[PDB]
Amino acid sequence: SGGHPLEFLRNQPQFQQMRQIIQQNPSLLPALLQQIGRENPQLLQQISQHQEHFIQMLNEPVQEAGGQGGGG
Ligand SMILES: [Ag+]
Numbered sequence: 079s080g081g082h083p084l085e086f087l088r089n090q091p092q093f094q095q096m097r098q099i100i101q102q103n104p105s106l107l108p109a110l111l112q113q114i115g116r117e118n119p120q121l122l123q124q125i126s127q128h129q130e131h132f133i134q135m136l137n138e139p140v141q142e143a144g145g146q147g148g149g150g
Pocket of ligand 1: 082131
């Protein structure tokens with residue numbers, strides 16, 4: 079529920095999904111956003127306001143690489 083503090087969203091598995099794939103596919107930013115908007119149209123609109131923070135933290139290295147991979 080942290081609108082400006084994206085770091086609180088970062089800890090959500092839904093965001094982990096985006097972060098892991100971003101590290102392999104940064105061009106998938108507008109694509110992953112659609113996955114957010116699908117389940118969370120409200121959260122999406124808030125992310126649209128705070129995209130800068132979103133993309134920056136999406137790009138940082140994450141612990142869980144992701145079992146589904148995403149990249150390739
Ligand atoms: Ag800020």
